[PDB]
Amino acid sequence: NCDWDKSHEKYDWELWDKWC
Fold first, then answer.
1. Dihedrals φ, ψ of 9, to 5°?
2. How many helices (H) does the chain have, and how many strands (E)?
3. What does DSSP assign to residue 1?
4. What is the SS3 assignment for 5?
5. Sign of the Cα pseudo-torsion (4, 8, 11, 16, in order)
6. Three-class DSSP category at 16
7. Cα 20 from Cα 6, distance rounded (Å)
8. Half-sphere exposure of 9 (CA within 13 A, CB side)
9. How many CB atoms neighbour CB 11 within 10 A?
10. Are 20 and 9 in contact (CB under 8 A)?
11. 19 half-sphere exposure, CB direction, 13 A CA radius
């Protein structure tokens, strides 16, 4: 995805690095 951050239902705080 990398199209959402700190808002997505699957978004991850730490994993954010790859879940940008």
1. -65, -25
2. 0, 0
3. -
4. coil
5. positive
6. helix
7. 9
8. 0
9. 14
10. no
11. 12
